[PDB]
Coordinates of C-alpha atoms in Angstrom, one line a residue:
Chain A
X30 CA -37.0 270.6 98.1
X31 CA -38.6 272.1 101.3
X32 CA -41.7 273.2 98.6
X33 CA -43.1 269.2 98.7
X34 CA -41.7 268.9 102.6
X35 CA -44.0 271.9 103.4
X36 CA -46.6 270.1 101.0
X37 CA -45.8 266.4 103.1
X38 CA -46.3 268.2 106.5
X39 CA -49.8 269.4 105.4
X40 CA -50.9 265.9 104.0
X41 CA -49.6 264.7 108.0
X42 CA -52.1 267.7 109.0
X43 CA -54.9 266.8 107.0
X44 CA -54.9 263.3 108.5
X45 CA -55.1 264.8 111.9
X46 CA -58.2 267.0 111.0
X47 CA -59.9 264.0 109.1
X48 CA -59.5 262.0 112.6
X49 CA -61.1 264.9 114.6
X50 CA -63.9 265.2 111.6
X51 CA -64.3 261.3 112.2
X52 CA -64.9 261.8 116.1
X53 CA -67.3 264.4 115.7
X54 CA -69.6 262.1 113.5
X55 CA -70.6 260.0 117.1
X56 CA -72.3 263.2 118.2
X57 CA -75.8 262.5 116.8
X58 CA -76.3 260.7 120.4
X59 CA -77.1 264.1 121.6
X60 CA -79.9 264.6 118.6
X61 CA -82.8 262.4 120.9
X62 CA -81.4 263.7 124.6
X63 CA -83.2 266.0 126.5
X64 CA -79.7 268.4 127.3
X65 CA -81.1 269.9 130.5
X66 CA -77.9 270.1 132.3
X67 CA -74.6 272.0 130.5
X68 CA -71.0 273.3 131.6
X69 CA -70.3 276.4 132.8
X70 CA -70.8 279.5 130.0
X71 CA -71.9 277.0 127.2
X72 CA -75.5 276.8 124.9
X73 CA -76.3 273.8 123.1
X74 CA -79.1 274.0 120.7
X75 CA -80.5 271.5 118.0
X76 CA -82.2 272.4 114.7
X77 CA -82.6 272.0 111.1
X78 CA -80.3 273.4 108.5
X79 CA -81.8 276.2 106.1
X80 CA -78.5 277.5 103.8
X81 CA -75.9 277.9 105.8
X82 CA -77.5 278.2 109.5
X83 CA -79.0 276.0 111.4
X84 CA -82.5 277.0 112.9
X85 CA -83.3 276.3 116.5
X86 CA -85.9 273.8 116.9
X87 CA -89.1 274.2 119.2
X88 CA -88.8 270.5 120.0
X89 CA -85.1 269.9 121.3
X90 CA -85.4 265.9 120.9
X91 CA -87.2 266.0 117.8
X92 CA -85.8 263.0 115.6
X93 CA -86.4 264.7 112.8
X94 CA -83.1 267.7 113.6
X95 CA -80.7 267.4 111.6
X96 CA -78.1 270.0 113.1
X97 CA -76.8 271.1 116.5
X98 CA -74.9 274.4 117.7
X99 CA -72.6 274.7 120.8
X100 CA -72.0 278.8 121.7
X101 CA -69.0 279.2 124.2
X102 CA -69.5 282.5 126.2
X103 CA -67.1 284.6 127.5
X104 CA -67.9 286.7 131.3
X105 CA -65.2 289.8 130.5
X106 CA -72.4 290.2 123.7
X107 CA -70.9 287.4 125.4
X108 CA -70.5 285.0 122.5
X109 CA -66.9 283.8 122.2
X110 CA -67.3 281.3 119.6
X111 CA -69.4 278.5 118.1
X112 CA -69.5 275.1 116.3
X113 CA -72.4 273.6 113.8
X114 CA -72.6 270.4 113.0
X115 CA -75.2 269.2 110.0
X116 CA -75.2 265.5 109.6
X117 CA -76.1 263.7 106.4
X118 CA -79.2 261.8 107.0
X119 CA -82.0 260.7 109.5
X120 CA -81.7 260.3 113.5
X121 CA -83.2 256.1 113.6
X122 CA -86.1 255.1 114.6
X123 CA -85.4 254.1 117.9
X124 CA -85.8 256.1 120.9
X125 CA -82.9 255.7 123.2
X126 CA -80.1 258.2 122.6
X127 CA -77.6 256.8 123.8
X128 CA -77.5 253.8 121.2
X129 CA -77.8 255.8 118.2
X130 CA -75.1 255.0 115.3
X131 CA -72.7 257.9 114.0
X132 CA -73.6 259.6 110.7
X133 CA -71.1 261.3 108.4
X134 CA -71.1 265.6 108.4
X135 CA -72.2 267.1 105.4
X136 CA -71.0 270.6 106.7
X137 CA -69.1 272.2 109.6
X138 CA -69.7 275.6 110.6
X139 CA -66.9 277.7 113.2
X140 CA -67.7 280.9 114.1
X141 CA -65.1 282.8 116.1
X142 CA -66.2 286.3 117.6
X143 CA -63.6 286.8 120.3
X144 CA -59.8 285.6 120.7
X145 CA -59.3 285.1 117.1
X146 CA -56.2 284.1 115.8
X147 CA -54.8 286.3 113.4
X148 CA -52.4 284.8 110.5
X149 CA -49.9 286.9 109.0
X150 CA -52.0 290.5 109.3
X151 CA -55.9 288.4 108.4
X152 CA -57.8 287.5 111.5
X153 CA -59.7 283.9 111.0
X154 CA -63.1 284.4 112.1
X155 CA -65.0 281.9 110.4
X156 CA -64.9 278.1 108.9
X157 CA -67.0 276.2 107.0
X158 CA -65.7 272.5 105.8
X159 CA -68.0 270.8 103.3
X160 CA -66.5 267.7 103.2
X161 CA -65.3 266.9 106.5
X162 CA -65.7 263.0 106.2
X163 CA -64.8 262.8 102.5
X164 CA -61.5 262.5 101.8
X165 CA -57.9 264.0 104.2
X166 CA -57.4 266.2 101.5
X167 CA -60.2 268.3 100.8
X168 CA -59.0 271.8 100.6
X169 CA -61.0 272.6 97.1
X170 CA -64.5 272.3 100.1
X171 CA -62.9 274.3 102.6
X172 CA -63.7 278.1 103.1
X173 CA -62.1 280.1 105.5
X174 CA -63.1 284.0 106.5
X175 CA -60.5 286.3 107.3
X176 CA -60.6 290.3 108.6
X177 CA -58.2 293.1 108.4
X178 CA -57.1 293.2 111.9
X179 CA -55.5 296.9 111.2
X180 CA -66.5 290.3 103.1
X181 CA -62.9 288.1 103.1
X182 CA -64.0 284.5 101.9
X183 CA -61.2 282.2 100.7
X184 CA -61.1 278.5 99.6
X185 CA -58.5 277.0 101.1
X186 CA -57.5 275.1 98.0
X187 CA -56.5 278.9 96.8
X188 CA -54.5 279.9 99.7
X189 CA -50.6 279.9 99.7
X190 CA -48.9 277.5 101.4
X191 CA -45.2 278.0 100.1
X192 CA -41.7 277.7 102.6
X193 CA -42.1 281.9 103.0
X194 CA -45.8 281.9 103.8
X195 CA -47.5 278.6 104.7
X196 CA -50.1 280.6 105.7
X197 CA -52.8 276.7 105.6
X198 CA -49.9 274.9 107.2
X199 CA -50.4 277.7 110.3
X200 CA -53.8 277.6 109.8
X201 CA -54.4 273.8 110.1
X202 CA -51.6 273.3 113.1
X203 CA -51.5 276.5 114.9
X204 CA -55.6 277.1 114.8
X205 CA -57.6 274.1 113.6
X206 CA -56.4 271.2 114.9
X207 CA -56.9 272.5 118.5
X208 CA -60.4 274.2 117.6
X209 CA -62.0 270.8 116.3
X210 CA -60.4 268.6 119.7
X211 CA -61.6 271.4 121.9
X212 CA -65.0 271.5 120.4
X213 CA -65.1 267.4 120.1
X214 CA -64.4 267.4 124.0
X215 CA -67.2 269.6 124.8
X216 CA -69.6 267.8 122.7
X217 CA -68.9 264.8 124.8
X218 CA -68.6 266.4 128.3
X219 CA -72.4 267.6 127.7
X220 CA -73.2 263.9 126.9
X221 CA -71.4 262.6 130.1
X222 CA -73.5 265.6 131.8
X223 CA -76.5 264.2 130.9
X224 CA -76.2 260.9 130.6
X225 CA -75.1 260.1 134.3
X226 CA -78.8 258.9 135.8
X227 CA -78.8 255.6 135.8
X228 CA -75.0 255.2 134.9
X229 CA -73.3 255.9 138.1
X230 CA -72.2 254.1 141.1
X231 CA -71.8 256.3 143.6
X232 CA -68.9 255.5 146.5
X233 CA -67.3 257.8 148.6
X234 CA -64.2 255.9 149.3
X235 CA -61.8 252.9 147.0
X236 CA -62.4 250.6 150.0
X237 CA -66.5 251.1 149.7
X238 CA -65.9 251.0 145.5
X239 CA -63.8 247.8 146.3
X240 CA -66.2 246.1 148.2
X241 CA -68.8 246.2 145.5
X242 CA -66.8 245.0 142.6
X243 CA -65.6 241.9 144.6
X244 CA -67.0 238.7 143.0
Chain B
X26 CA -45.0 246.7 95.8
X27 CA -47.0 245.2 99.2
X28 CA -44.2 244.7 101.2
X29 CA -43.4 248.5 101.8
X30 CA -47.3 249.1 101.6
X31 CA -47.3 246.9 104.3
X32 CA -45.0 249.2 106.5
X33 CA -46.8 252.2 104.6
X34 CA -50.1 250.9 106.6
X35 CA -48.0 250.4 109.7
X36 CA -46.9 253.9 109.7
X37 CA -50.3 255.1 109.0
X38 CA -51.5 252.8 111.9
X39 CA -48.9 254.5 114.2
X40 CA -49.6 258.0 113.8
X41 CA -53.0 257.1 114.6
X42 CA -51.8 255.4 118.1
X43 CA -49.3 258.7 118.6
X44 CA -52.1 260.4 118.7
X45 CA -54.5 258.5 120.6
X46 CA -51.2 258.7 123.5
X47 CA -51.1 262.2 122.8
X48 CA -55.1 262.2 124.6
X49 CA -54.3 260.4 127.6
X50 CA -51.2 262.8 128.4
X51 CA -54.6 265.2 129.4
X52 CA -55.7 262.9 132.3
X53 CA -53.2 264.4 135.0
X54 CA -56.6 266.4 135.6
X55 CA -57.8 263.3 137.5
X56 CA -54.7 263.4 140.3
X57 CA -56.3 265.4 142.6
X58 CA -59.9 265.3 141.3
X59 CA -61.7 263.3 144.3
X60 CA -63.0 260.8 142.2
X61 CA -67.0 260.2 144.3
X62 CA -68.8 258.7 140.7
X63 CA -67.6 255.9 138.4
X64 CA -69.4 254.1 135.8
X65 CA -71.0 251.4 136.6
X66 CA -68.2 247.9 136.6
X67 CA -65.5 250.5 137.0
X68 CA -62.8 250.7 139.5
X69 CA -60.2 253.5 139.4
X70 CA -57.3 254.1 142.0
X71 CA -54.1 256.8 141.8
X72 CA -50.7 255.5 143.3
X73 CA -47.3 255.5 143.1
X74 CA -45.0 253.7 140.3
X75 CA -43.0 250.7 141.8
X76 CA -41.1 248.8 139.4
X77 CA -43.9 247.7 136.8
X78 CA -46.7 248.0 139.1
X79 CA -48.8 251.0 140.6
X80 CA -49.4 250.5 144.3
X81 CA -52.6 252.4 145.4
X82 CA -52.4 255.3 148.1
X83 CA -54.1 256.3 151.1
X84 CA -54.7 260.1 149.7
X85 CA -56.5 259.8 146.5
X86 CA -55.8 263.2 145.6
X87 CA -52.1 263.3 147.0
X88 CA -50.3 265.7 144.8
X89 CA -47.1 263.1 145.2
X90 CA -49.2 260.5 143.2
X91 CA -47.8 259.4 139.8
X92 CA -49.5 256.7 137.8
X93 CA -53.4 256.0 137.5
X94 CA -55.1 252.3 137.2
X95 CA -58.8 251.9 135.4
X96 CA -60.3 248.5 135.8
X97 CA -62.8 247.0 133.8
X98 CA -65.2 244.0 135.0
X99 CA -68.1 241.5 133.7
X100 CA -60.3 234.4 139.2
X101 CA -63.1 237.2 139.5
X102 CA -64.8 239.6 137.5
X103 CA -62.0 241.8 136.0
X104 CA -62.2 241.9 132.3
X105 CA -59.2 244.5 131.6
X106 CA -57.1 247.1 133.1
X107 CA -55.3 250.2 132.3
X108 CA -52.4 251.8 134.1
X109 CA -50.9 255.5 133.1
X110 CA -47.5 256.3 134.6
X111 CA -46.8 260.0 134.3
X112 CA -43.4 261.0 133.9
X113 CA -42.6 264.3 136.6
X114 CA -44.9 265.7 139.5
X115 CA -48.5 267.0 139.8
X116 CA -48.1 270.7 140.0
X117 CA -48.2 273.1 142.9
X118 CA -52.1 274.1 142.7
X119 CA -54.9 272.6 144.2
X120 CA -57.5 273.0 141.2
X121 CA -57.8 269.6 139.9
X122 CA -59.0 270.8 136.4
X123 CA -56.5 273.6 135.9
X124 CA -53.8 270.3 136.0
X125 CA -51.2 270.6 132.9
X126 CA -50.8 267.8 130.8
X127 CA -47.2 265.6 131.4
X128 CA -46.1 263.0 129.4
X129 CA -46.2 259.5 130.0
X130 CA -43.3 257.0 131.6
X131 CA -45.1 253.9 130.4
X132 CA -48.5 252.6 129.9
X133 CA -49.8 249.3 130.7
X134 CA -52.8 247.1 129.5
X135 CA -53.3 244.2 130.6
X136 CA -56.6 241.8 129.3
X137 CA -57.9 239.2 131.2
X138 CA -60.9 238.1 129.3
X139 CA -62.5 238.3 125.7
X140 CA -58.9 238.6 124.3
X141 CA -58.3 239.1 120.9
X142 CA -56.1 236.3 118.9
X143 CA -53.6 236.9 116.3
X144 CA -52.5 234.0 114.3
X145 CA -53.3 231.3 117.0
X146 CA -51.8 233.4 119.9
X147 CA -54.2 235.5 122.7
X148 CA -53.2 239.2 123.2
X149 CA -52.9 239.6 127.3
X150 CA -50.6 242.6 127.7
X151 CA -48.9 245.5 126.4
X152 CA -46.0 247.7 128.1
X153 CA -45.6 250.8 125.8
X154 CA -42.6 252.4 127.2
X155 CA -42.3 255.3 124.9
X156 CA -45.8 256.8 124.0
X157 CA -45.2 260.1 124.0
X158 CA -41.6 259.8 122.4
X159 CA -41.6 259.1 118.3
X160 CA -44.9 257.5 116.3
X161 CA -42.5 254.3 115.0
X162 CA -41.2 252.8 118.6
X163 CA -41.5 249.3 118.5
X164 CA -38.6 248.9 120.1
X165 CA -40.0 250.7 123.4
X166 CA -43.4 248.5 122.8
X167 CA -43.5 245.0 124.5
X168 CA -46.2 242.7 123.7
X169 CA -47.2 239.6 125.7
X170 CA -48.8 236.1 123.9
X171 CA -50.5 233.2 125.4
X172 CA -43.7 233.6 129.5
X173 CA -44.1 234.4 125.7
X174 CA -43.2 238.5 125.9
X175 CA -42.3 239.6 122.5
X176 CA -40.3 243.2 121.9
X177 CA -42.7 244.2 118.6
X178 CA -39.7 245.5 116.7
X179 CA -39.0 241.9 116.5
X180 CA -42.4 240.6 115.3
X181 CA -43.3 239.6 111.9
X182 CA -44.6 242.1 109.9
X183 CA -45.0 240.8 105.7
X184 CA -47.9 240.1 103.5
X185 CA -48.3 237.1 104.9
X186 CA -47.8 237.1 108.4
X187 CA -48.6 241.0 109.0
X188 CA -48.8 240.3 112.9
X189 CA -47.6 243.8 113.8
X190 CA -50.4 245.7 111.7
X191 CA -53.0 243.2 113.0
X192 CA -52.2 243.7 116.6
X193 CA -52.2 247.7 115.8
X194 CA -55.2 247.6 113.2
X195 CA -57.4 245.4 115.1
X196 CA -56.7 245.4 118.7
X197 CA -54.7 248.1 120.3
X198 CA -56.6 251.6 118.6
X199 CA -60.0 250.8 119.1
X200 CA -58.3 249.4 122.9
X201 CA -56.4 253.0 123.3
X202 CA -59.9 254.7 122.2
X203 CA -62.3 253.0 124.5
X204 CA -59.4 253.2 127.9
X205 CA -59.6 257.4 126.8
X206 CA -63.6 258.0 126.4
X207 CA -63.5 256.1 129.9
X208 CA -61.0 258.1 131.6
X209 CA -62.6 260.9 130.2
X210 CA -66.1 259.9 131.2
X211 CA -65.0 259.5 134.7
X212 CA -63.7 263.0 134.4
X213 CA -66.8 264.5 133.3
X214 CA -68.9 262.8 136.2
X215 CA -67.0 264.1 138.9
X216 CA -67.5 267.7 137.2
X217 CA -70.5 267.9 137.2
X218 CA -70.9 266.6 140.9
X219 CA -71.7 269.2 146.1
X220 CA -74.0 267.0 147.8
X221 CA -75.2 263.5 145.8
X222 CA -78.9 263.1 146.7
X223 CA -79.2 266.6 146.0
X224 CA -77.5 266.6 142.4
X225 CA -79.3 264.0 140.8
X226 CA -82.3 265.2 142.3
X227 CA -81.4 268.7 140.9
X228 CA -80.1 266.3 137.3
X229 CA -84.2 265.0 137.8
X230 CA -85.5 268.2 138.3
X231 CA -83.9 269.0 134.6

């Protein structure tokens, strides 16, 4: 009855998350680029992966990084919330950012310190997905962290998701579909931020931008 | 079965374009944004709707505006254009990236050069006029082949002509996915941007 329908809406789910994993893969552009230049209350760092962190590297453009962190702050110890990425593979051999090819995730890391959403009584405060580019449904490689809001590691696979509580059906539409579009859209708004020189016509007014383009 | 697998992939192909609608619903930011920096062999212009056409206005960031055109260049230059018609009115703030976003009247593309065939025919515009209303609405989607403007709900769609999931499949994602990272692009640049020589001297500097 509604026991598949609740199951059907979560397989429509998972194919939204597996098309926000598949954007995130065209983020190893930033891996070479010097990211000098960043949006208000945001850190961007690139490392290597040890476990299940990924270390800041002395050398920011090192080709040899395989996995970047974006830290949101929060102006109200500031530290809102975080995303790691750790890609499968190499950065190439060339060394222009901007031309390097996408790479599939091995792991993805979401930390959430402030504003959490909280699911019937368990706040979610971490995420880790260790299949993000496998297959949609992948719930056996996802763990979720949850705190009493009134230590908590679950695999998704084992969480209920039944007509009275379907407890991964809010989890995946109320919380992490938005979380991995917000956190794609930064990635690429620190791109645009510092790959402008060079890229930009500059004209104050259409009739000026008109001009240019007309031949 | 590969007849019903055949509107299986359709289905799966039209989620993906719901969604892909769904992102450009986000560019009402660019309204009142003053839009200084483009890409280079990029044009963009905010106007009003009239009829099937977007007529440019004389204040850029006039709340009043209602539809958006992106041009593309390379009979001219002009390789391909995109034009977003917002349904409703920009709301009553001034903040440009504060901008809630509305859902879309219609949304046309129309391709000038490097068009893609299908089966012998050249792709030169779409009208989708429902993008924001139901993932299947080929009925609302009309489709124009090198005069020759086809509703898709009436095009061939089997194993062996599959004409719909080829046009969907092959052309008009990876189209809907470029016209988005571009508005969004343009966006981000004008962010960023507060005196020019100064900025990308400061952008140097770092």
């Amino acid at each position: 009855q509604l026991g598949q329908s609740i199951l059907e809406t979560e397989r429509k789910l998972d194919e939204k998350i597996f098309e926000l994993n598949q954007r995130l893969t065209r983020h190893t552009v930033l891996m070479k680029m010097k990211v000098r230049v960043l949006p208000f209350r945001t850190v961007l760092f690139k490392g290597k992966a040890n476990n299940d962190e990924c270390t800041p590297a002395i050398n920011q453009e090192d080709p040899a990084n395989n996995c970047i962190r974006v830290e949101v702050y929060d102006f109200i110890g500031a530290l809102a919330k975080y995303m790691e990425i750790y890609f499968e593979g190499q950065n190439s051999n060339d060394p222009e950012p901007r031309t390097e090819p996408p790479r599939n995730i091995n792991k993805l890391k979401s930390k959430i310190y402030k504003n959490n959403m909280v699911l019937e009584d368990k706040i979610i405060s971490e995420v880790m997905d260790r299949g993000p580019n496998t297959q949609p449904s992948h719930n056996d490689k996802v763990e979720v962290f949850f705190q009493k809001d009134n230590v908590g590691k679950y695999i998704l696979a084992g969480v209920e998701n039944t007509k009275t509580h379907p407890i991964r059906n809010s989890f995946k539409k109320e919380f992490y579909i938005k979380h991995l579009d917000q956190f794609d859209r930064l990635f690429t708004k620190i791109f645009d931020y510092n790959d402008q020189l060079g890229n930009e016509n500059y004209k104050e007014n259409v009739d000026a931008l008109k001009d240019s383009l007309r031949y």
